[PDB]
Design a protein around this ligand. Structure first.
Ligand SMILES: Oc1ccccc1-c1cccc(O)c1O
Ligand SMILES: Oc1ccccc1-c1cccc(O)c1O
Ligand SMILES: Oc1ccccc1-c1cccc(O)c1O
Ligand code: FES
Ligand code: FES
Ligand code: FES
Ligand code: FES
Ligand code: FES
Ligand code: FES
Ligand SMILES: [Fe+2]
Ligand SMILES: [Fe+2]
Ligand SMILES: [Fe+2]
Lengths: 389, 104, 388, 388, 104, 106
């Protein structure tokens, strides 16, 4: 749909993934935190190329497509919510219910044949761990857990985070996140010295190809993902050499981090433990359009009561957010941006020269290709196109 | 209940006839070979008259945007149409076409 | 020519209009006021995607294409008008007559065989009612009257106005201006309160489709237009309800305006009377390029003498320009801009869902499709293309 | 490969040249001055659409493609020169030798099978006359002399200059430079009055077509170029007329300059003598991408020792750079920019209306088409493509 | 008036011969099978010699930009040519090609 | 050691590929082209793909990752994006037993 046929024909291992430039339809995606959307104050966002409106009504979230059925304007240009349960387009006053998108009234013509006979697209919305997830897809949604990493939804796991818009395709963010050798870019991070981390420069892999990963398609809640097992048989690199001379050392701190790293459809990394031995990182790379993603960062720490939660929140604000989410992951942001040009014409998918640790990235590309729930197309964005046969 | 439309010989195969009802929305009658079918005249995607469209077998194409419906089932056949038409029962009696004055 | 053939095949009601992204060739268009161009001060503009130069010589307007025949530079990068009747390209001094575009001299080579053997495109220009009209077309122009709404050219009609560039395709401007139900966007206008206008939220149509409009296929001067008759058998909506609860009211003023609304080729709206019972509005949406139009606004008032004209000019500047041309029509500008994304890929022309009051727009699209005098193409802009 | 095939079939005289939007591969191009690249300070540039890194190591220049073989990032986003002879990609620490581009180490995986089995693209670099030339091509380079105008490499010719990025295609710069009639744009240059130049407005050509130029393809060092001989049978124009009346005159100074003008592959102009009777100008228009070029200006003056070199440098900084390289050639920059729109869709190569002095430009188009050493394509930039 | 150009047999079919004329623009003589036609040599769009172009039937293609003319009527056949060519009557008498002194 | 036993010639159909795994060394690929046998390194020189998992078209192997390709007789690239030649290993049949060299040709 999205890429030159001649390129898809070349990438036989993962053509659906290379075609998925706008992301995978029929998955849940986090787009904001619960505390960013207040009762009766609709908010705009773009998800998989689609302009959406989210509102909170009697504390519950509702999602309508931000595009009037009539002349295709964004309702959000001038929001008229004239009754608790409805939104009225500012142009000709086509009025929609938040609950089912049904065109229930038209103030410019209360006798119109369109009334009761059209409906604006709605998407399911669910709040978990103070994060707002939208099911960008069709029909009754699967359970959220299918599209979250293991432990994210644990009862005791306290989730805090940060979200922002990044100028790369979502797939560059996923691959960079799951890339076992990219750890090299983190060698001078403030987190490394200031939280006393052990952090190698890379890995000499060992064992066969199949031993480099654990492909999960046997998970009981339907989760689909890959574990990076490079370090199970691999020798970590702590002295990098050129011409046999040591030019760089890894970090010889006491804190062991990033024991288990896993990537999950639709594009969420779990790093455990990280950025401290008693915490976890869960981060999404959410497709906004072909050029941009939400970098939706979360940190999890099991907490037993309000005392532990408030102390966790204080350390999040004073240490983990500045030192890890920014001080560590900022280098990931510009690493993603640096790949844009090579992949922007889709020729990077052909011309890339991979080495051994990219086996993790290949395993993800195959998993994603085989288990995604649909390819988003420009026609999903504009309006689906089909001719009688 | 039944509206008298035309003599069945008055319609060639592959042709469409607009039925104006006083005090009600217009109907469209389609002759597909020797069978007759009836729907709402107004396209569900807008305000087009389907009687001004093009019939290709049992599929009516809307003149506004090229949306299309099956004239037997009233179900959409081409984008951008998504809402089914009202189907109206047709009956030929003594070589004369009759349309049911309400939908089925 | 201009749109995906797969889209033009779908819009059988009005394919030429949907194709007409750059506007209709072989019509008159207003582009500026007479007062904006002075003797021997050439002025640049873009019209139907073409760069043009207009000059005033011995009081009379002349229009040349702002593109040298030789290497395709704009003459206007560095204007050299070295004699009253000519302009000299700054690059190699190819010299053209304003009056007929003829290449009459080349200062860099006075023996060139090109001299007297090439012609820079000219377009007719006419001033009427203080407004500068360019015929963006080929051959002998029709009367200006053909391309102006009824009464604009009446002897006693005093025209004052304002012009600006707006970031939407010209068609989004036309349809918004002629849209009977778009009156909703004006419900809070300062004009409605401060000029005590009656303004419903919209109309519940009555009678049949054919009664909703009146198409004019010809008159004395060959005008082509549509009147909006929704109010003839329609019920004005003054109470807006959701689930039967009243959530909004129309404006219950005494002043009845906008009794007749008509749209004319090549894209000029007449609202009579407006914004006051004794006045009319005529507004053009002039294609500059695919993305942009002139919003050329005029208010007309019959005036018998210089005292009436002077008083009208005072009321225009103190009241009608700020309260109506700005205070009312400013909401039209951002409504036009809000439709850009949906039509920008040309897919809105398929995917729109029309309702009853859009019969007005449909009648305009068909009239425009049937009676336009030509489709402007990118090839008119770069140079017409034909292989034998 | 770069232009609509329907346009290329129309320009039978010079299709390769019209296709060469990114410039010609397998030639030497100047990109900076020697003084601008210091020991162990790598410098980024784009040449023929390719991102390049230049570094100076033990005083020698080396050029590597600024694109890691692995995931196609620019090394230059974060340079890591860890040893004197190497650069390490910041991403996964693939390590390349400046001298041959061999992937000689990977810090993130010292056991990788890729080590010693890949090679980053390198290009020959050489410094001559204080100028850095890169051979943007494949295999053993030809002598630099081949891609330089006569006398640029002379023993005693002291070269000083200036370089900047200009927003036009390189060909518009070349044709403007070599265009005999474009001298018209220079008629008010501060150089003309302040250096007492004789400068006509243009030329009335004489004699036949072949006499308007000298096509050089017999030069023993293999250089390929064209001399403008319009002045050998032509009458210079000092009195510019419209309708036979004098509206502008040339300059009647005593200093005779631009006796010989030649354009050379890959796109370097020689004007002699200029801007003074004891000096020469050599200027390159170096393709950066489809839209931009280096304007690489040099002035040569014979100098016998350090004292003359020093007084020339002081004259250059106080007179020739501001009065000539800027005061004369600034008009060339905006002339080049003025042709962008006409040629940007590639249609100006069909629609241009040439006159007699353009014989020189046509001679260059045909020379360039016949004798260029290859057409740079977008596939050279992204990675060459071939199916078995 | 009439200018004796060449022996008919001096031109192979589908060829063009430039006729230089002291104090006047050159002409192009076209042999189209066994017929002869004449125009101005100079393309009306530029400085191209039509005698250096490509004859396709009775249409000369300019070598510069692919503009073209009907050599019988002189009218443009292909963009970017818009100004008609001067046509000169030609007469073949006793295997000798004569071209009119001035265009019709 | 010098000659590595692969399989019986008869254990391979024309147009097929067999991977030969080696202790302490990178895998080889053996190709049957009609009645003839050839061997290269199994790892694509453009990346980490196995050529034994590709498609053989006469004497040209097509890599399954990116559609690059090699001549199996010469090891020379046949399709972009491949640029680095494969190591070629001599193959011999002795008692109808396929043998591949332990060391590539120089
Ligand atoms: O994946 C990792 C491996 C080793 C150390 C840190 C990381 C890591 C931590 C947080 C977010 C990410 O995207 C990471 O790759
Ligand atoms: O079209 C109208 C209908 C009722 C009241 C005002 C208007 C009107 C007047 C001037 C310009 C416009 O765009 C209008 O809609
Ligand atoms: O080419 C020229 C002819 C007459 C006078 C000046 C020049 C000239 C001088 C320096 C740089 C250029 O590109 C010129 O055309
Ligand atoms: S565009 Fe929303 S009601 Fe018309
Ligand atoms: S109105 Fe029928 S397809 Fe749109
Ligand atoms: S571009 Fe105008 S005279 Fe040359
Ligand atoms: S992108 Fe350079 S080492 Fe990976
Ligand atoms: S010079 Fe003949 S087509 Fe342009
Ligand atoms: S890995 Fe074989 S073609 Fe890329
Ligand atoms: Fe990272
Ligand atoms: Fe309005
Ligand atoms: Fe110049």
């Amino acid at each position: 749909a999205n890429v030159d046929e001649a390129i898809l024909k070349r990438v036989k291992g993962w053509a659906p993934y290379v075609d998925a430039k706008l992301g995978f339809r029929n998955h849940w995606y986090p787009v904001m935190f619960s505390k960013e959307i207040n009762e009766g104050e609709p908010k705009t966002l773009k998800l998989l190329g689609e302009n959406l409106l989210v509102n909170r009504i009697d504390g519950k979230l509702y999602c309508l497509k931000d595009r009037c059925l009539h002349r295709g304007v964004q309702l959000s240009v001038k929001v008229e919510c004239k009754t608790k349960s409805t939104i009225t387009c500012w142009y000709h006053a086509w009025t929609y219910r938040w609950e089912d998108g049904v065109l229930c009234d038209i103030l410019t013509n209360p006798t119109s044949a369109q009334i009761g006979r059209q409906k604006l697209k709605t998407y399911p919305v669910q709040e978990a761990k103070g994060c707002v997830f939208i099911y960008l897809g069709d029909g009754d949604p699967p359970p959220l857990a299918r599209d979250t990493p293991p432990n994210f939804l644990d009862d005791d796991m306290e989730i805090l985070g940060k979200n922002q818009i990044i100028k790369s395709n979502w797939r560059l963010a996923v691959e960079n996140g799951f890339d076992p050798s990219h750890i090299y870019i983190h060698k001078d991070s403030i987190l490394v010295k200031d939280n006393d981390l052990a952090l190698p420069l890379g890995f000499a892999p060992g064992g066969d190809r199949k031993q480099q990963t654990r492909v999960v398609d046997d998970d009981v809640v339907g989760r689909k993902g890959v574990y990076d097992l490079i370090g199970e048989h691999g020798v970590p690199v702590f002295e990098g050499t050129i011409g046999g001379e040591v030019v760089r050392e890894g970090a010889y701190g006491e804190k062991i981090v990033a024991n288990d790293i896993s990537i999950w459809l639709p594009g969420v990394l779990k790093v455990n433990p990280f950025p401290n031995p008693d915490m976890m990182q869960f981060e999404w790379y959410v497709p906004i359009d072909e050029n941009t993603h939400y970098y939706f960062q979360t940190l999890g720490k099991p907490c037993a009561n309000d005392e532990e939660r408030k102390k966790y929140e204080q350390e999040f604000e004073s240490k983990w957010k500045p030192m890890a989410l920014e001080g560590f992951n900022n280098d990931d942001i510009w690493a993603r941006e640096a790949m844009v040009d090579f992949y922007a014409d889709d020729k990077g998918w052909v011309n890339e020269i991979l080495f051994e640790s990219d086996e993790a990235i290949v395993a993800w590309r195959k998993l994603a290709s085989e288990h995604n729930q649909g390819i988003q197309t420009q026609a999903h964005v504009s309006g689906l196109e089909h001719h009688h046969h | 209940i039944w509206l008298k439309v035309c003599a069945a010989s008055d319609m060639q195969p592959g042709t469409i006839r607009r039925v104006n009802r006083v005090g009600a929305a217009p109907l469209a009658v389609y002759r597909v070979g020797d069978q007759f079918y009836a729907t709402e005249d107004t396209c569900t995607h807008g305000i087009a008259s389907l009687s001004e469209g093009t019939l290709d077998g049992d599929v009516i194409e809307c003149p506004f945007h090229g949306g299309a419906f099956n004239v037997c089932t009233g179900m959409p056949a081409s984008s951008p149409c998504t809402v089914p038409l009202g189907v109206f029962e047709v009956e030929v009696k003594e070589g004369e076409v009759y349309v049911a004055g309400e939908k089925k």
